[PDB]
Design a protein around this ligand. Structure first.
Ligand SMILES: C/C=C/C/C(C)=C\[C@H]1C/C=C/C=C/C[C@H](C)/C=C(\C)[C@@H](OC)C/C=C/[C@@H](O[C@@H]2O[C@H](CO)[C@@H](O)[C@H](OC)[C@H]2O)CC(=O)O1
Ligand code: NA
Length: 994
């Protein structure tokens, strides 16, 4: 029964066919349980296993690198040399990274909590039911409960299923629907049906939702829906169906992997096409097995050279170090990738109360009728000082302090604010200030009564605690609070029936003090108070009332007006039906207007600049609020979303308006709307869908379970620190101080990280491009091997990894918030940037190959050899006469490879300094700016010397120590890379920037 709220209690019993006295018979229990199933959310199966590891080896590059290990393992065993430990190193280190890199991607254990599992914390273990097999109540497992069950609930009990209330045994039934609404105010429930079939959960005043817990009272009802059919269940299915996309950066890296695979695959074919001349060679010239060793040992080098093996470790360390910066700036980021995509935030949908405002409600102004006479009419405006819940303030008229007690209208003003009020004040000694108890709205009225002091009570003699509820208690001495008519969205008001104490205070029997929305209350007023006297509600007077209320709400004050009226001749205690919530409005009729009070929910102290900060950053800010369209717009103009004097008729909508628009115009409205008032529960996720349709990175925010689906669907889900756990687990970010400013502050960090992140990405890729050119040059020309795959890995992992990680601490390029958001489909390298690192990669390739060729030919300690015979090193044993000087092992010498490797390492240290800034010259930007970079460079070169000195290492890397004689040549060939890059930077700023 999904529409059980609209059906009467007799109808729900008739549908399921169950007796309220007996309950479901064990036969029915078997039938209902086998039909509707168990009352429990589906166990989130489809979890990770060994398959999660398989997913890491699904891409193309990972298979190419894996293939490099298999081919390497084949060539590892096949060798004549009697070397032991160095045998299984090439295929060993590959698995080390392939395993390590896979573990990083599989790392979704500690860096990501489950949202649906946190949602299962609301469904209780056991629940009470009345079955036909027994007489007394019997508690069973909540899962065993089925639709049609006659369940029982009391105070403290957690509601097991969506229950249609049948009978309330206690005096009044209160439930804390904080998770399914947000307001901590325990709403009062009733038994009568709600006529609207598609009414919102907040309107269903005869339903107990699962997950909710009874704050007070005891009642019995029939179970309407269970499992996924409940309100919690329907929210769960929305989250389960919602698929989260991957950050635009992640899509670029997956895209780069596909491109890099074609590059490796193309070069492998290119290398084979260059050696197509071997077709025109004798079969007795040698063995094909010797040529196959070259083809296989080359391909493995290509895979290792092209791939940036250290990249994943570099970003994981950077983003982890970026997470700590987020936490310090009040921003608990969930996942690692979230810190980067945060900078690409183009839209920020935020809630007004709590986030944009301080939630420190306080009455600022208030007016009453001065006197009425024909067409003439005059009011009596006042102003209250002290934007806080503390009574430390005063009342003044026209910027002059006055005694509130001297106005009879103000006396009843404070009377209604004190009586018609369930909240109160409470002084906290630990904090050292006055705290609120209940609603922010009602507590402000409590504070107002304390400031006014209409009956002139002693205040200086009182203590700090007695001062809390002094004036309010004095009011309670006069009138007795008989009963209160609960607040409802149908009439938008609240009244309280009151009887005078035994003292004869000139009271006309009993009274009703109304409090609620202006337009609703003023219309039901047929009379108007004038201090002590009363006059009929005339036209001219009603104009002045709504005009001032219009001025306060629409004006710069942006006040939440609240009309206060009183019923002088209310119906008798017997005639009033206390259970019928619909008749409450009729009871609140024929009222006498007393006065209006205007309160303000003060905007955040820093939102003025944060909003303006988004204006420059090109980020669109949309406000979601519960205020009316008129005031919501006025508030938007105040904080900065709107200008003080611009047109915003189509740039702002209500829940009613937006819902009435067609599907096409709803999407058209979301691309220009910057304010949504009176928003429906499901409208949050709708707006996200329309925003996502324009390929726009959205940042929706919430706090309760209602917003979970919207947060889950949004790219950047934002939750509050004071929000529920489900909102936190579903969101990508959690605001520590619940501030809109900390969102923008985090977004600014997101762009700063992405700039530094994108920088070392081009740095590593630049090195990988050079390693491919080094291999292709030494292979195509037919030269001896310049670099070994075991060497290239240690270069990408350590020597390039350390500085690349140190590049994450690069100084933030100022004026970053001046530029617009990073485009989702923006390439990492393109145009001039591609040519820039292409030339840099092109030079290092020739430098490393030339460095090795230097030792083979024009060397000091090396042999005096020429180029034409150096390319024919594979024919050393064959063509004996042409090659004669020393052993053939000299072609496979460690010296020339040490030169090629030293030149590669030295240049990357210089290229790391080139990566300090993208275009800013090293003359402008000092190389010693980033201290962590210099520390990493010193550590890298220290490790470079380590693999040459400490004997155990160089034997494995196939290297031999170089003296000062050989190191000089390395610096001569390496250092020129800075000058070349300096020229490219100079060309970029001059003949490009325009
Ligand atoms: C981009 C932000 C990601 C967050 C993060 C915490 C970790 C990321 C950092 C990403 C590095 C990418 C490098 C590209 C390069 C060509 C590939 C190599 C060296 C690869 O080695 C050949 C290593 C890849 C390891 C990472 O693998 C993940 O594999 C998944 C399945 O295909 C993809 O969905 C992820 O796409 C972004 C991808 O990152 C381990 C990992 O999670 O690392
Ligand atoms: Na999400």
């Amino acid at each position: 029964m999904e529409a059980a709220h609209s059906k009467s209690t007799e109808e729900c019993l008739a549908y399921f066919g169950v007796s309220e006295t007996t309950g479901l018979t064990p036969d029915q229990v078997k039938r209902h349980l086998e039909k509707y199933g168990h009352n429990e959310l589906p166990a989130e199966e489809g979890k990770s296993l060994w398959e999660l590891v398989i997913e890491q080896f699904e891409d193309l590059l990972v298979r190419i690198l894996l293939l490099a290990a298999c081919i390497s393992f084949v060539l590892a065993w096949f060798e004549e040399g009697e070397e032991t430990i160095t045998a299984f190193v090439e295929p060993f280190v590959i698995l080390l990274i392939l395993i390590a890199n896979a573990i990083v991607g599989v790392w979704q254990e500690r860096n990501a909590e489950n949202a649906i599992e946190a949602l299962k914390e609301y469904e209780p273990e056991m629940g009470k039911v009345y079955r036909a097999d027994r007489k007394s109540v019997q508690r069973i497992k909540a899962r065993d409960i089925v639709p049609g069950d006659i369940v029982e609930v009391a105070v403290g009990d957690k509601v097991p299923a969506d229950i249609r209330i049948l009978s309330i045994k206690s005096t009044t039934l209160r439930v804390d629907q904080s998770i399914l609404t947000g307001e901590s105010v325990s709403v009062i429930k009733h038994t009568e049906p709600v006529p609207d079939p598609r009414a919102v959960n907040q309107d269903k005043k005869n339903m107990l939702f699962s997950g909710t817990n009874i704050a007070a009272g005891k009642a019995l009802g029939i179970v309407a829906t269970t499992g996924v059919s409940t309100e919690i269940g329907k929210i769960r299915d929305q989250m389960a169906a919602t698929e989260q996309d991957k950050t635009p950066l992640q899509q670029k890296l997956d895209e780069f992997g596909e491109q890099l695979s074609k590059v490796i695959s193309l070069i492998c074919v290119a290398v084979w096409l260059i050696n197509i001349g071997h077709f025109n060679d004798p079969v007795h010239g040698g063995s094909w097995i010797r040529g196959a060793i070259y083809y296989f040992k080359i391909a493995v080098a290509l895979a290792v050279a092209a791939i940036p093996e250290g990249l994943p470790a570099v970003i994981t360390t950077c983003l982890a170090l970026g997470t700590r910066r987020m936490a310090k700036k009040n921003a608990i980021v969930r996942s690692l990738p979230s810190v980067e995509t945060l900078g690409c935030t183009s839209v920020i949908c935020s809630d007004k109360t709590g986030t944009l405002t301080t939630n420190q409600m306080s009455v600022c102004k208030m007016f009453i009728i001065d006197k009425v006479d024909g067409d003439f009419c005059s009011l009596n405006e006042f102003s209250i000082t002290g934007s806080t819940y503390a009574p430390e303030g005063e009342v003044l008229k026209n910027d002059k302090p006055i005694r509130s007690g001297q106005f009879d209208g103000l006396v009843e003003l404070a009377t209604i604010c004190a009586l018609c009020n369930d909240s109160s004040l409470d002084f906290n000694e630990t904090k050292g200030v006055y705290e609120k108890v209940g609603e922010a709205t009602e507590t402000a009225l409590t504070t107002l009564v304390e400031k006014m002091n209409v009956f002139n009570t002693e205040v200086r003699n009182l203590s700090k605690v007695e001062r809390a509820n002094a004036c309010n208690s004095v009011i309670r001495q006069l009138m007795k609070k008989e009963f209160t008519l609960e607040f409802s969205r149908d009439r938008k008001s609240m009244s309280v029936y009151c009887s005078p104490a035994k003292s004869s205070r000139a009271a006309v029997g009993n009274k009703m003090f109304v409090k609620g929305a202006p337009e609703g209350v003023i219309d039901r007023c047929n009379y108007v108070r004038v201090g002590t006297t009363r006059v009929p509600m005339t036209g001219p007077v009603k104009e002045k009332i709504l005009s001032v209320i219009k001025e306060w709400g629409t004006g710069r004050d942006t006040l939440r007006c609240l009309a206060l009226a009183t019923r002088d001749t209310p119906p008798k205690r017997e005639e009033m039906v206390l259970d019928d919530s619909s008749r409450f409005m009729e009871y609140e009729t024929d009222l006498t207007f007393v006065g209006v009070v205007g309160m303000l929910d003060p905007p955040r102290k820093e939102v003025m600049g944060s909003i303006q900060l988004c204006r420059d950053a090109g980020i669109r800010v949309i406000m979601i609020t519960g205020d009316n369209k008129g005031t919501a717009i006025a508030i938007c103009r105040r904080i900065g979303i709107f200008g003080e004097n611009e047109e915003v008729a189509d740039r702002a909508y209500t829940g009613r308006e937006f819902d009435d628009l067609p599907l096409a115009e709803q999407r058209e409205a979301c691309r220009r709307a910057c304010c949504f008032a009176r928003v429906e529960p499901s409208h949050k996720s709708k707006i996200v869908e329309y925003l996502q349709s324009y390929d726009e990175i959205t940042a929706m925010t919430g706090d309760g379970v209602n917003d979970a689906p919207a947060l889950k669907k949004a790219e950047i889900g934002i939750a509050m620190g004071s929000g529920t756990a489900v909102a936190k687990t579903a969101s990508e970010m959690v605001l520590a101080d619940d501030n809109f400013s900390t969102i923008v502050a985090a977004v600014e960090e997101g762009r700063a990280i992405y700039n530094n992140m994108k920088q070392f990405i081009r740095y590593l890729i630049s090195s990988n491009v050079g390693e491919v050119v080094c291999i292709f040059l030494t292979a195509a020309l037919g030269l001896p091997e310049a670099l070994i795959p075991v060497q290239l890995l240690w270069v990408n992992l350590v020597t390039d990894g350390l500085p690349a990680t140190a590049l994450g601490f690069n100084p933030p390029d100022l004026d970053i918030m001046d530029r617009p958001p990073r485009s989702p489909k923006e390439p990492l390298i393109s145009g001039w940037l591609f040519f820039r690192y292409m030339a840099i990669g092109g030079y290092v390739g020739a430098a490393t190959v030339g460095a090795a060729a230097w030792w083979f030919m024009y060397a000091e300690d090396g042999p005096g050899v020429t180029y034409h015979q150096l390319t024919h090193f594979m024919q050393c044993t064959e063509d004996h006469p042409h090659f004669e000087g020393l052993d053939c092992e000299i072609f496979e010498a460690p010296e020339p490879m040490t030169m090629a490797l030293s030149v590669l390492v030295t240049i990357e240290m210089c290229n790391a300094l080139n990566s300090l800034s993208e275009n800013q010259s090293l003359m402008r930007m000092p190389p010693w700016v980033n201290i962590w970079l210099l520390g990493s460079i010193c550590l890298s070169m220290s490790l470079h010397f380590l693999i040459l000195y400490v004997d155990p290492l160089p034997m494995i890397f196939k290297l031999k120590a170089l003296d000062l004689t050989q190191w000089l040549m390395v610096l001569k060939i390496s250092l020129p890379v800075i000058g070349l890059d300096e020229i490219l930077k100079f060309i970029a700023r001059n003949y490009l920037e325009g």
